[PDB]
Amino acid sequence: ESWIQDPLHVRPIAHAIWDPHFGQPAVEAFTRGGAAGPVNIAYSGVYQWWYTIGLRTNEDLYTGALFLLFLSTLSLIASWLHLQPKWKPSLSWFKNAESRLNHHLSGLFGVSSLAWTGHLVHVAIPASRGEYVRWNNFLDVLPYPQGLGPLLTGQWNLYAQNPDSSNHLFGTAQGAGTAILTLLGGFHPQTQSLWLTDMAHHHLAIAFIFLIAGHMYRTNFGIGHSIKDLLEAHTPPGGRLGRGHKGLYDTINNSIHFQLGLALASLGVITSLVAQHMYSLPPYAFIAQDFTT
Amino acid sequence: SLETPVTSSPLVAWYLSNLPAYRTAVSPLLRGIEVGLAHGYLLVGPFALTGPLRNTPVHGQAGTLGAIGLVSILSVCLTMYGVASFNEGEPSTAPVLTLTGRKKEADKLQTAEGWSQFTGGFFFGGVSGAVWAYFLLYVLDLPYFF
Amino acid sequence: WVTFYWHWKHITLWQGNVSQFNESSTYLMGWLRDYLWLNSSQLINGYNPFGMNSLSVWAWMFLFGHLVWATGFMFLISWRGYWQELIETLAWAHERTPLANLIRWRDKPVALSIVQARLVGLAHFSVGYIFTYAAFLIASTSGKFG
Amino acid sequence: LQSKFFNTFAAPFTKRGLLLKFLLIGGGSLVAYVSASASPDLLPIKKGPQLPPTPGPRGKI
């Protein structure tokens, strides 16, 4: 709560120190950040990320703790549940490579990105304009004073009308525009981060690509490609690639160590991609001046 | 092995053969309480005199608390061994043959029931030994170098 | 070589001293003098015979990084057959010491396997290599916060 | 005489199942009790600093 009041002069605090080997001059030394005893300064940059995405007090965090704690409890149930008989999937269920790629592409990657757009324009963006929206009242407030219309008509050209002014203070209403989806591309002048209204648009844009990319493969309804067929069909004439991709369907779809290899390779790249983009295009407010973070 | 002076001699073979661990013909409860007496009264020194409170007037009562715990931990480390190295109804694993060749009784200590008796001897002796140091060293406390 | 490059280029930028990288970064002694040696002045003073600072914990971890890393070599260089002959002598000494032949290993002691040593040796090398750099990265930057 | 005096006064601590429970549970309670009720003048952490805080570089951040 204090760090919010001045992000550039209050060391974020990670936790408290209680080590009964500490002597007295250490107890003094590690007391900082405006605490009462020794503490550790948080360098994981959580403080800025939760500022941006709309959290504002301690109390939001406590329910944030409980909810995730509940989600953890739910998962532990599932790991037990799917070992008993009459709840364990058969082989053919796991080896269904088509029906899985539809859901993962359209449901997992897809809807989640659409819903995160929902949170950005129902809580986050309103937070950065002085509006405190929570589960108590989020039915009264309108994301855009004419909301839910302009989209139905077809003149979506209103949600980018009047964006945040150049002279904006991140936590209050000065210069606060009313646009929710924009395309500005610059930096927020005060906080040296990407604009909120761009990031809402981008998660909305790629919320569509995956949804439409999700209906490719055939599951039960007689339309859509067969991944076995696509591999066979791509056999170059002239023989330079031999029999081409014939038979790679079974070899992948029967070797776990193959599937894991591909997953790691793709995951290995984008993590480097994440590292390269974050430091150039700071996506969280007041994180380009916390040099250590 | 080899018979050197150290491994065999009247003085050596009388010293070892008459301390509780080797008096194979007495009850393992007492063999536990002697052992805990000598060890317990032993280590009260370094905790009290070299601990982190030696300067403070609680050096007497901070060493004793330290030694008391260490006896308790070894009591656990004793019980873990007894419960994992013997079975409740299996006989003794001690050698039953003396050097002369007389086949003597197997030691009761090397037995689940015996060892559980022995640790009862060690623990009670360990705390009793470590208080007896504290009483002497801070009541009858003149001559010592403390 | 990647994180080194990112840190030094930025640590000169944040101070507004961008000339220092652009000249020293063409010869190796520039990297050793102007980045390693120079920027670790505040870290190593985490605790000295004059006093301590907030940076002491990072100074301690810094050496702790050097220690695990240097233990890594022990498992990579010295291979198994030497240690196995060393255990056998030890497992003889324990079997002949009086008062200590009363305690018997349940699982016989052997030196680590050939693959295990490589894995263990690499575990130390990696852990020591992360902790060392992670301490220098945080302390040096946070020392100046710029 | 020492045999009989010792033999009866160490019997409760002998059954290895019970000795293991009381050692950990009782001990774990005692460790809890000693630290939660130690004097602040023998544990530096248990007392606060009670001294002014030194600001960090670049203001307080």
């Binding site: 408290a16 209680w18 080590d19 009964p20 | 931990i73 656990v76 873990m80 419960v83 994992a84 | 349940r106 699982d107 | 293991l20 950990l24 001990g27 774990g28 460790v31 809890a32 630290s35 939660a36 248990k46």
Partner: peptide
Amino acid sequence: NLPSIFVPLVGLVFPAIAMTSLFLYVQKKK
């Protein structure tokens, strides 16, 4: 207050019971 109890429990007791619990399980025989 609360740290002074929970730090020892996870630092001293919870390790001890853990090590002694595994040691029996590892060294069992059936």
